[PDB]
Design an enzyme around this catalytic site. Structure first.
Site, mmCIF file in Angstrom:
data_model
loop_
_atom_site.group_PDB
_atom_site.id
_atom_site.type_symbol
_atom_site.label_atom_id
_atom_site.label_comp_id
_atom_site.label_asym_id
_atom_site.label_seq_id
_atom_site.Cartn_x
_atom_site.Cartn_y
_atom_site.Cartn_z
ATOM 1 N N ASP A 68 57.086 -14.828 -7.652
ATOM 2 C CA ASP A 68 57.628 -13.975 -6.581
ATOM 3 C C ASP A 68 56.679 -13.805 -5.378
ATOM 4 O OD1 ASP A 68 60.064 -13.231 -8.275
ATOM 5 O OD2 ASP A 68 58.549 -12.168 -9.465
ATOM 6 N N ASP A 74 48.704 -20.688 -0.966
ATOM 7 C CA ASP A 74 47.361 -20.648 -0.425
ATOM 8 C C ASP A 74 46.361 -20.312 -1.539
ATOM 9 O OD1 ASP A 74 46.108 -21.172 2.044
ATOM 10 O OD2 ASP A 74 47.317 -19.673 3.084
ATOM 11 N N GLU A 97 37.519 -22.173 2.344
ATOM 12 C CA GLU A 97 38.043 -21.587 3.563
ATOM 13 C C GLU A 97 38.584 -20.178 3.253
ATOM 14 O OE1 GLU A 97 41.418 -20.666 4.727
ATOM 15 O OE2 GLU A 97 40.160 -19.975 6.389
ATOM 16 N N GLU A 98 39.060 -19.996 2.017
ATOM 17 C CA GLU A 98 39.641 -18.737 1.540
ATOM 18 C C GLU A 98 38.661 -17.671 1.062
ATOM 19 O OE1 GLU A 98 42.852 -17.333 1.339
ATOM 20 O OE2 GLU A 98 43.361 -18.938 2.770
ATOM 21 N N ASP A 118 38.816 -26.894 1.711
ATOM 22 C CA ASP A 118 39.906 -26.115 2.309
ATOM 23 C C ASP A 118 41.044 -26.422 1.292
ATOM 24 O OD1 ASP A 118 41.653 -24.814 3.988
ATOM 25 O OD2 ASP A 118 41.035 -25.935 5.765
ATOM 26 N N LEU A 120 44.401 -25.422 0.831
ATOM 27 C CA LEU A 120 45.703 -25.833 1.322
ATOM 28 C C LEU A 120 45.691 -25.691 2.833
ATOM 29 C CD1 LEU A 120 48.327 -26.828 -0.030
ATOM 30 C CD2 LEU A 120 49.057 -24.489 -0.008
ATOM 31 N N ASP A 121 45.246 -26.741 3.497
ATOM 32 C CA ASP A 121 45.142 -26.769 4.947
ATOM 33 C C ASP A 121 46.484 -26.983 5.656
ATOM 34 O OD1 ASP A 121 44.900 -28.744 7.415
ATOM 35 O OD2 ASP A 121 43.043 -27.545 7.414
ATOM 36 N N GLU A 280 36.469 -29.005 7.328
ATOM 37 C CA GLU A 280 37.568 -29.571 8.107
ATOM 38 C C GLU A 280 37.013 -30.694 8.986
ATOM 39 O OE1 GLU A 280 40.778 -26.962 9.679
ATOM 40 O OE2 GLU A 280 39.521 -25.232 9.359
HETATM 41 O O1 LIG Z 1 48.527 -25.026 16.318
HETATM 42 P P1 LIG Z 1 47.052 -25.213 16.703
HETATM 43 O O2 LIG Z 1 46.437 -24.036 17.378
HETATM 44 O O3 LIG Z 1 46.941 -26.432 17.575
HETATM 45 O O4 LIG Z 1 46.196 -25.263 15.358
HETATM 46 C C1 LIG Z 1 46.568 -26.193 14.291
HETATM 47 C C2 LIG Z 1 45.356 -26.395 13.534
HETATM 48 O O5 LIG Z 1 45.057 -25.253 12.677
HETATM 49 C C3 LIG Z 1 45.168 -25.521 11.319
HETATM 50 O O6 LIG Z 1 46.474 -25.122 10.848
HETATM 51 C C4 LIG Z 1 44.106 -24.735 10.493
HETATM 52 O O7 LIG Z 1 42.796 -24.711 11.023
HETATM 53 C C5 LIG Z 1 44.971 -27.075 11.306
HETATM 54 O O8 LIG Z 1 45.563 -27.649 10.147
HETATM 55 C C6 LIG Z 1 45.598 -27.591 12.641
HETATM 56 O O9 LIG Z 1 45.131 -28.830 13.208
#
Ligand SMILES: O=P(O)(O)OC[C@H]1O[C@](O)(CO)[C@@H](O)[C@@H]1O
Ligand SMILES: Nc1ncnc2c1ncn2[C@@H]1O[C@H](COP(=O)(O)O)[C@@H](O)[C@H]1O
Ligand SMILES: Nc1ncnc2c1ncn2[C@@H]1O[C@H](COP(=O)(O)O)[C@@H](O)[C@H]1O
Ligand SMILES: Nc1ncnc2c1ncn2[C@@H]1O[C@H](COP(=O)(O)O)[C@@H](O)[C@H]1O
Ligand SMILES: Nc1ncnc2c1ncn2[C@@H]1O[C@H](COP(=O)(O)O)[C@@H](O)[C@H]1O
Ligand SMILES: O=P(O)(O)OC[C@H]1O[C@](O)(CO)[C@@H](O)[C@@H]1O
Ligand SMILES: O=P(O)(O)OC[C@H]1O[C@](O)(CO)[C@@H](O)[C@@H]1O
Ligand SMILES: O=P(O)(O)OC[C@H]1O[C@](O)(CO)[C@@H](O)[C@@H]1O
Lengths: 337, 337, 337, 337
Positions: A68, A74, A97-98, A118, A120-121, A280
């Site tokens: 749920d 994440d 990252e978390e 990271d 789940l990026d 990243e």
């Molecule tokens: O939409 P924006 O500001 O260009 O940021 C997207 C960036 O941020 C993230 O979601 C997280 O850092 C990346 O995966 C991505 O390249």
């Protein structure tokens, strides 16, 4: 001249990791690390593809389905990665990252590797099923001092292994080490990653640029000039096509495969870029370089930056060598004080 | 209602579709059709995710097949849809993007519906694991003559059902019919689409614009002026974010969920536009209008166009009503004479 | 037929069930019921195969659950079937092996069918991965009074549909209704049961007998004499092979496919027999008779018995007609007086 | 006294195999072998569970589905095993139940292990979805002579690793090595085998005997007396329950887990038993012994027999120690010339 016998061959990640670990004559601690990593990715792929979603939606009355809200992607991904890695008895420090702070692996399970990841990026956007992934970087611990956040603070130049998993239309793991870059496709019917591309090299020059133009208002004059030259080529040749997803892994992966340039420049709001350095930029910079591309902040190489904070940010531009170069020159042309 | 607290039971596509068939007092022919698209979508999904790829790479020994070129996804997909479609006993004419001609179903399997589809949209980009999809539009045959290519040439306004499946980080089916748009999430562990979002409505106004700016040199003055206002707002409001996957279902889908505007107008190498009318534009327009958005070519509504050819192209602009409206206004300011 | 060569198209359960509903000019209530059992079977299948077990063993960290006792399969199964059943809006009374009482469906979800089932038959044996199954019997409610336990007490002769799903080396659904028995193979890659065998008929005479001879000390003289003739044929013909899984669906299913006889008569610790009438004996009897076999208690036909209690037991002997006949003959020779 | 810190742990087969290989200080060649083996089993599980069956039944028109007849499970399994193992560069000789002759691994991929396996055991009966499995045995090559069938001819006492995979209601891999027996459950959502039972030991005495009584006519007086004592216990205690599937892996696995005795004695027809020595008896004998059970031909231990033919057969009795002993005594009581 070259000749050959008969050889049919299927290479799984597991096979590959063992062979390389054998060639390297390692104690096998790193092999156990990459193995645990492969197992983490597979478990994240199944969650991201939504297997089990029905239980969250009351198929079994939801009597017992602590999903749920008490099961977000994440965090689950963070949990899976953290746990599977500590369970490898090969890591001493984890930077996620978390997590605001560096995780210092219990004395009982300490190993010598530092892992910056990271989980789940690009997850912020999967409500609309955007491609997401997992980025990771591995450093060897050098200090003989008790493990500390400090051991994570090494330039990207010091990475022993780096890579990412792309949960796109299919799941790919890209692994780059000293010897090179290889891409593995996950066969989800048997749970095995098959080497589908060996020794990946990026095109010298690509035909696609990738950047979020909504920030055009805040782009420095170097980027502005570059982009304009991409759209309106002075030599009246074909303009670069444009594509930009919003998920780093997805954009960088496309860049690697088809060539071109990805850019997430510094702009006043995120004066030092948005993408974090340790898990990243660094891993992607390392991958890019092993495949023959370039990865710069605009002023200097990404892999040479020494971090002073695990959650530090850094601007970044990467892609085919001839394109990153063409933009680096433009930075030099406007470079002053 | 008599008394009903916080309750919400599981609704599978199959259950949903059947209920709606009973409410409509249908003979069950459309239901068999919808049932067949579902199954079709599930099989493509699996092939997309690469389940069983190990076999191709020789895991069980490549005994004597004609190379790696055994199952090209766009073609497998074409086959699956066409065959599970003919087997529903609910179709008389099938129009596919992969086929130069319309496919007229044998009288034994001949039913009353005409189905337009794009089995695997965005497939050229698949090499880099970018989200791809399947688009379908369903027309009730409105003639007395033998079924023919002509039965497919009805304006999108005559569609009875339209939807699409996006193979992204998860497989989702968005279905639109007379009453509204509903979204089904595929739980791959059990081969069932769970109803996760019902009677969906797009935001009135969004904050993302989607366009391949690699064509800025070829855009008309209105598109140009429009793109310019999102980047540098004249009223000094926050600029629109930019995002463009280069794959329609993923772009249109991000637009439906978050809001904003998607655009694919004509340029200097596609005066009629690039996207096809029958199986790309019409289905996404129908879904957009049903969700409460707009779909225009810049000068006229996409659903009102009368096709003259089955592989006809058409420009399209779709998204939140207030953004699509704004662009139309601009298109009027630059009016033709 | 006009002209039809070597042709055979794909028939999914969903397609099949719907066709049969249309032929029967049903309102579609039974179809929603069958559709719901299907989905139910698919979810149990997945849980049986252990998909996601990693999670239980702490792969993502056992944060704070109450041990390993989270999801007991027989109970999960019970939940799933009951809930996807109530959600069909086609049931008024549900009788489960796991429930002391009959479950009367809320009038909001109340439909006209009564469903008897054994969610996970042979579950005690699951620790050793032996094939298990789900058995279902469907009765049309034949009363005017409020639904109650009584609506379930109709002889098996009044069944409208009955079948079972066997979770063996593969998941198979065997469905029996008025016309015949049909077998659907689950293709787990797509969550679809493919029609692989239609209008199935058991062999007239088989060559395998199935019985738990660990009870030889308690068998009646006819069973004893019978078992003795299969082992040491009086006419010096080849003896019958023996096989007994100890799990009913697997035993009954092997009997349907290869032929032979399955037996579970009374002894010195189960005078009424062990197998339950409503949800074990009746469904397998109905399937057996529809396949052209017999199902007797030794003295009377199983489908003709009038239940007096929902958890009533009954001996049963089922299989090929000529073998069941032979045993009955023996039962007559030792007749009672 | 014993004390402890905090340890949460998920052990995958891959992790386990590497650790053990590390403890053993092996070059890692055997680790690569077990890994390749795990990958083979997973691929056989997916085929046995029937994923893809729809393609054989024309879902994609069957235009390209070389399954039909040109894809049987027996052979596919042989192919997968043979190929995946040669691809490990760790085996020099392979003996399969499906190959009349020993397979002598190409010089280029030779390693030092000999592998005797049965690809899909009990397959003859999966038409009725009976539990099947894969049995394997691994010997180290001793001779410095060119590899030959000869290297396979070693008593079972010389096995370095032995085990089986059970494709039952769920997939289990049982691995026995010098240090002991461990059971791993396959999580098919992530393709990982999780150690679910560590160091398996069999009950001293069980309550189930397992034998095909149809051969009672041809059973030697020792078995006859044993069985009769099982059914009619002289001490008027409870008789043994009886179960017998007809698939060795299924019967032996149940025996291991719940205890008891399995027997497939010599009977005139198969005067030397039916089960083959090298890849059925030996591996099961080895497993039984590592768990603390007994495995005898009735006259001598199975693991001490020296084969003179790879396809040689051998009678076999195995199970809990107190039961096999109770039968061995009975053999001694009738033993003569
Ligand atoms: O939409 P924006 O500001 O260009 O940021 C997207 C960036 O941020 C993230 O979601 C997280 O850092 C990346 O995966 C991505 O390249
Ligand atoms: N699988 C592998 N691939 C590449 N190099 C490896 C591998 N395993 C070990 N090595 C190298 O050997 C070093 C030490 O191995 P280890 O002793 O296991 O920690 C690592 O830091 C690597 O540089
Ligand atoms: N979900 C549905 N299933 C069947 N019919 C529907 C459904 N939703 C709307 N209808 C209407 O029913 C009509 C005819 O029913 P049919 O006999 O099955 O062709 C369709 O063309 C639709 O306009
Ligand atoms: N496959 C089927 N689907 C629906 N009705 C069926 C089917 N097969 C037989 N029938 C008959 O149709 C009756 C009533 O239809 P219903 O309104 O859906 O309750 C059932 O009780 C059956 O006797
Ligand atoms: N994974 C393992 N588990 C148990 N023993 C192993 C393992 N790997 C290697 N060994 C032992 O070490 C020997 C030689 O290892 P190797 O050099 O790889 O061939 C094997 O024959 C085993 O007895
Ligand atoms: O690269 P282009 O020129 O922008 O084409 C992209 C468009 O083409 C398509 O693949 C369909 O033709 C769409 O999915 C997509 O949005
Ligand atoms: O071990 P027993 O006494 O023969 O019981 C086995 C029978 O019981 C059941 O589990 C149902 O009660 C059947 O599946 C099976 O054939
Ligand atoms: O039916 P039978 O003759 O008892 O033989 C079954 C035996 O044969 C096999 O099918 C193959 O040797 C085994 O799996 C099993 O134990």
């Amino acid at each position: 001249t070259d000749q050959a016998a008969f050889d049919t061959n299927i290479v799984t990640l597991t096979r590959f990791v063992m062979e390389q670990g054998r060639k390297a004559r390692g104690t096998g601690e790193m092999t156990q690390l990459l193995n645990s990593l492969c197992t983490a990715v597979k478990a994240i792929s199944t969650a991201v593809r939504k297997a089990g979603i029905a239980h969250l939606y009351g198929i079994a009355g939801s009597t017992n389905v602590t999903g749920d809200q008490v099961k977000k992607l994440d965090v689950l991904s963070n949990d899976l990665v953290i746990n599977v890695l500590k369970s490898s008895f090969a890591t001493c420090v984890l930077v996620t990252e978390e997590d605001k702070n560096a995780i210092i692996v219990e004395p009982e399970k300490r190993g010598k590797y530092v892992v910056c990841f990271d989980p789940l990026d690009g997850s912020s956007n999967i409500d609309c099923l955007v491609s997401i992934g997992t980025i990771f970087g591995i450093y060897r611990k050098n200090s003989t001092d008790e493990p500390s956040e400090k051991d994570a603070l090494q330039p990207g130049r010091n990475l022993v292994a780096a890579g990412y998993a792309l949960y796109g239309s299919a799941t790919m793991l890209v692994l780059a080490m000293v010897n090179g870059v290889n891409c593995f496709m996950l066969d989800p019917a048997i749970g095995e990653f098959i080497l589908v591309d060996r020794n990946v090299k990026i095109k010298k020059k690509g035909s696609i640029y990738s950047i979020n133009e909504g920030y055009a208002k805040e782009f420095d004059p170097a980027i502005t000039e570059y982009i304009q030259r991409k759209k309106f080529p002075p030599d009246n040749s074909a303009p670069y096509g444009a594509a930009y997803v919003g998920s780093m892994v997805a954009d960088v992966h496309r860049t690697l495969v088809y060539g071109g340039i990805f850019m997430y420049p510094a702009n006043k709001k995120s004066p030092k870029g948005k993408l974090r350095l340790l898990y990243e930029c660094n891993p992607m910079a390392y991958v890019m370089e092993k495949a023959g591309g370039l990865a710069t902040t605009g002023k200097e190489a990404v892999l040479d930056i020494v971090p002073t904070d695990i959650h530090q940010r850094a601007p970044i531009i990467l892609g085919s060598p001839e394109d990153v170069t063409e933009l680096l020159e433009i930075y030099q042309k406007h470079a002053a004080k």
